[model samples]
Target chain A: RGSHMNIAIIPARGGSKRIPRKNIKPFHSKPMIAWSILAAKKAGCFERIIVSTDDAEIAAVALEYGAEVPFTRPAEIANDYATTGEVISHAINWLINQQGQVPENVCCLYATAPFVEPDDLCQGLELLTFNKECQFVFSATRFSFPIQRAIKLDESGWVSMFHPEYQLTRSQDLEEAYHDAGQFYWGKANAWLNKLPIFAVHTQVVLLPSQDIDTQDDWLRAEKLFTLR
Target chain B: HMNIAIIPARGGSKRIPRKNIKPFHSKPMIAWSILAAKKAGCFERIIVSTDDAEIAAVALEYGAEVPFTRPAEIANDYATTGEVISHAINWLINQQGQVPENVCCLYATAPFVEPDDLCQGLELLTFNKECQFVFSATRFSFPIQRAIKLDESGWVSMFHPEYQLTRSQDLEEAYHDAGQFYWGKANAWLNKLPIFAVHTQVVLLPSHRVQIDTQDDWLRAEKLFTLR
Candidate 1:
């Protein structure tokens, strides 16, 4: 009987323009990517926690935090316009070509996700492992306020409702909405290889607080939530 | 027109201790409301209804009136805003024999309440005869259609699961009360009419400003206030 090889892939590219060297920057007590690696270790699901990075500094940090640096990412997909799906697919294929075997399951963990906990990773994997129909399981969270009541600014700078029809709808009666938590994604290796879309009904989700660390403002807000919690 | 402003500032703060009188930007938080009311120059009388003597003293220092202390029965957490406003209106009628034509209910912790916004609210109520109230509101930061509810174990499900695939631009925009101020006719306050109805209008404010309620909120609000 072949052992089920569950692989963990973390894509940390070097040429980050928005927040320079954010992946290896200090966050609270440790480097940012360390949190994801430590949580993956604590989750105890993966046979290998591998970090795919084009930067030597990030690879060193990942190794120091107990994650493997199996191969250097190619330069072609390490730019500003690269999509997460492409990077993750590349990592899976490289592992398959190098190891001469396929991983049973693969998870794409974001290097910037500091609030992701070990239990969230375990829950994500459990959902994908037990359910035959579920191809992927990921993290998501509720918006702080109702989204149906959202508004937009016009070219003249006037504020208007996005949906005038929902003007009279009571907040209680309005539908609840959620956005991607941008933390972790557990999928069958086949699903990751095929680059299947994640937001469909076939996926399950583990809930985490919603805060994307894309800008300096977001970084500060995330630190506030982290310290307060 | 006898326009009166009633500010509901209570001593019992569940989240941030003494939130109403808490020091914000080197001034007592309630002072912001009083200052805004004074700047608006619309209210003939700015009355603060409080159960705490300390809050009353602060309101007085800020040049607002405190005709009578709040009754203990109506000062508890159970008391609603309408109940407090009604008490003040009835007090003016019975004790002072003064009946104001228009009334504004301003919250004590609303530091971001601008004078122009208050005047605009008055204008809204004045221009529209059928409108019973005009209050502060702001657009929601995110769309509500994609909102998710979490279970005890931190699993996720959507409130409007049917709208999972709907684009945010395609969904209708929503707005919520800013919890800063409410402008209404005196009769409307006495009737305790619902504020979220069609008869009530809204004066929009920026989403970056917040009504301070939680410690996390206080941190963010203070940061924004300091930056300004």
Candidate 2:
């Protein structure tokens, strides 16, 4: 009910397998986590911008970039097996217990999202406010190509369309596909605590370019997109 | 049984100035494709067809021949790559009187095009005699069947709202032209055949490797080319 009740929680554990130490690693001339912290700072949507991490160095960088490390993350929710929902839920539950107040909205920003725009975060928050029924509002980008015309290769290496019936379908006629931008997810506090699926039909999506950094190849792509931007 | 690589370099690019030969990584952008062709030894003669004198000069500098300048009319924004390839093939047949069995239309913008991929495209064309075209392509990262669009009103609706519940593993994996290179039979270019024909095949490429469009896209390409 109060203003500035929205909280942006960044989940940045240190053990990034594909690209080591990616959460705190230098990308686009700053710590990768710094970008999310800066975006949250710029968005100015939360009562407190918190970073959830198990690593001391990642916590240090998160603090340096102006996000609160109110509580260090427990080891149980910080491992490779730890789901994003679990990391975020842990952040929310800790806040609810310590502060004795559940934030109206909670946003989970990814550490590797260099392409995250401040406008997207702002717009996503606006979407959350307007669409009271939606559980989540997150960045999503359309597939550049129509999915119906997709192909798969046999062991013998011959290619065939997944939907062979759509062989004659025009590209414009085909439905466009989208995926989580892996940038940020804004959800109602109840949704995060309840472990509600973010991709449910009830969730809203903010269309953003998919310049996410998951692999070394993606890291290069992000840098490339960064230079272009 | 000769094959040739014809790199298209239209100079009237509005998105990025001098897009055809702008320096990418260490050398000019178009040079990467030229070097790949040379390294692959895939063509008997490597040529660039462009309307701009600077582009022609750069192509020559990069070791690709530019014996003929592309006509100004076909070099405009509305012109298609198929048109450019058709024009070049026509020039070779009518003027040069040299008809190679295989011809490739390589894009000047693609920095990810490798010598290995070009060789693969060549081999694909050679291995599959019925196939009229083999081009560089990559699978879409997301499933298209469940694609939704966000409108100005902030409503998200599936473009194909009918397939909202399609299973992920059951969905097809779509691909698009990597805008890198295309291998085509000489006769097919003369006939101005569509590159996306049912008979056409493609060499699968990793998604991150190929990119372009805006001036920013060109700048980003330089950063990517640094790795290659």
Candidate 3:
């Protein structure tokens, strides 16, 4: 609700190996990167929408899709070794350097997720806006089954619970779990700049039912869902 | 609010031969559906209905419940997907004594269904008190008004011959059934002779993506995946 409170950061790096050129790849006729950009713009959440990337093509596409690219991501921070946190911090630092003003809140939106509904993105922002206890918020999806029943294959190929004793327990009896959708993450601008595990501080989860594209198979699945829904 | 996932894995397969268990990419084909369902998080229960023990085992390994093997009659080649779904629903009701307010039927071939679409479907069914069924559908790249069907003489005739002269932009946009995800109120599906008897909603998706039903379809999906 506050005009100065929020900024949206979209981290799009140049190199992706699993699905080469995945960030800019076409999905449903538009480049995949447009999904998140369009989603954030439509949600009407932020005072500014920025795309953080080192690639010229991605930057140009991000601009075409109505996102601002004020600075190119430095090569060291744009490589595979760079963590999302570093990319986010770079974007925020650049903004502060240019304007000498820092946003009170920020949302990290991923370029791969197109199914993130405007309502869901707004809902996550609302959660942070209303809850003072929440230092950070990110989208997650609840596990369809209990995680305790999950198994891992040992070196000998024996099947054992990643946690065990819970195997016999019913899914209804186990505690519910969730996984990050990798679509959106929002936090107090200072909290994000601190490079802390946002979830460890005052964290909240915004549940999203869509999957984030990563692998080749995942991209296909996402495209199908896009086509189907 | 309550979500149940149904995995329809039929035992009989002629094309692609044992297509359900055939490895596509890496794991057994059915495992992708199971894992995707699990990943989606909207389902409170994930049930896989299959007549094959290997399919059941694979479903179990991937975190879906194979509560009971599908009945022999419903597991045959002539069985329709709706019949298999009804059987699975009945089995879960009987075995777990669990009743869900909403049921989502996900196909084993759809490894790409997003959890969000499932949530949206459930939410749509729940909030729209008048609507009873919701399923995923994708917009056709070209409107279906352009579709042609072959006649007995093997001549192509416009499916809707009257609309042949209509401008493409003037025709109403149409959606092809994704044939991947279906959601409905349990009572609505269980009570109806045909699930479509109830008011239905279509969740529109972008075309050119989603599942593998035929070998060529599988290849296209793989290529899309590679390019993406």
Candidate 4:
């Protein structure tokens, strides 16, 4: 294991197509990434909290918020085509090569995860720590509505049920559904390097309010939810 | 042509305090429902049924009629929608001397309700003799086949684990009541027949609409309204 037992790698890119300056944008009086950094710090799980970004401005914000930017991310993995696994694997390899050590576990926290709390991170880490068979532990939330009665629109805008048979079934009789919260992912260092899937059966999940800040609407929803908390 | 709109706006809102009269966007939350009813041009009279005096005044200011104060017994948290609708219908028969041909029960908190949607509900109820109710509904965002539930110990289990391997598009899509409006025939309202029975139809709404139950839900709906 490296000097740090567990590391937090936050992958934040500077170029946000939907919302301009999304990573460094001020959210609830602090930079967006600061929330995740503070949550990781409060969790007391990670030994080194790092921000992987190609933009120097994002790096500066990371530094200002007490997160380490040990190295600048290269242009290749900083583009739109870069996947989360690719970014995380790259950061782990860089840490191994530079520090000459391999951390036991690494948690990839999203920069836009303002609702993520210290307790959530703590619970996620605890699940991954004790579960020997699990490859990842992440956040998830249940669908507020029953999904069996969902409908789709035709090209002409005519609507029909996807499950016409379930039309008469009561909501309580229908199965409850959950989707990825898209907030944080706790993975073993070996799993990260191997590119094991995060949504597989081998993974564990901690429940949180469902949010995805991919568009302006999502961002506004997140901000409104933040005010209540 | 004797369609009437009945809105149940009780003052005892435990989740969001004074949720009926609470300001939403530029006006009070109930105003949107009243405005939508007015714009729809389907109802002969738009009535606000409430035990609270403040809600009655606000309804009057927004051009909705409050002919009679709702009895305190039916305004409590345990009151049912069927009970409220029956009460309104009974009051109309006794006091107004005329029974409505059709009744549209509009929720006070439905901010996303458009006039077109309300009109469509009335059209369905009028055209079909067998159909007794037409209410607003919308599709669920995710597939129910792959649904999972957590136990008290934080362990996960699937409701229908057999469909875990099924693709979302291949699995059947599902929907639920949007809780915006329910258009029912006068006979159906008086009889208090079941709403989810086969005699009822659904007017599908866009996925952006949601049922407002909790503060989180209110926030989501408000953001959707303000931003859209």
lDDT of each: 0.79, 0.79, 0.71, 0.81
TM-score of each: 0.63, 0.70, 0.52, 0.65
Per-residue lDDT of candidate 1, residues B63-172 (tens digit): 99999999988887667788899999999999999998888999998898898888888888877677888888886655666666554544456667787555566776
**Winning candidate number (lDDT):** 4
DockQ of 4: 0.18
Candidate number that wins on TM-score, 2 or 3: 2
Write one digit per residue (lDDT tens) for candidate 2, span A1-229.
7456888999887776778898888997899889889988887676789998889999899888889999889988877566778888988898889988678899999887766788888899898988778888988876655666666655544556666786545565655566666688899999989887666666888876436465787776567657653
Question: After TM-score superposition, what is the CA distance of residue A77 in candidate 3 from its true location, in Å?
Answer: 1.3
TM-score leader:
2
lDDT of 4 by residue, A1-229 (tens): 3454888999998987778999988887998999999999998988889999999899999999999999999899988566788899999999999988688888999998887888888788888988788788888887876666665544433345656776545565666667666688889999989987665667778876535566676676667767752
Q: What C-alpha lDDT, on a 0 to 100 scale, does residue A137 get in candidate 3? A: 77
Please compute the TM-score of chain B alone for each predicted structure, in the order given.
0.94, 0.90, 0.87, 0.91
- Ranked by lDDT, the better of candidates 1 and 3 is 1
The runs of at least 3 residues in candidate 4 whose Cα sits more than 4 Å from the true structure, single-residue gaps closed, are A1-4, A74-76, A79-82, A209-214, A217-225, B6-42, B45-177, B182-228
Go through the candidates in order and give each one's DockQ: 0.18, 0.19, 0.02, 0.18
Error of 3 at A92 (Å): 1.3
Q: Worst 10-residue stretch by lDDT in candidate 3 chain B? A: B149-158
> Per-residue lDDT tens digits of candidate 3, residues A1-229?
3447588889988767778888889888888889889999899877888998889999999999999988888889877456777888888888889889678888999887788887888898888878787777777655433444443333422233445455334454554445455678888888878876643436777755425455676676666656651
lDDT of 2 by residue, B9-85 (tens): 98887446787787777778898888888998868999999999998888988899998989999898767787888
lDDT (Cα, 0-100) at A125 in candidate 3? 81
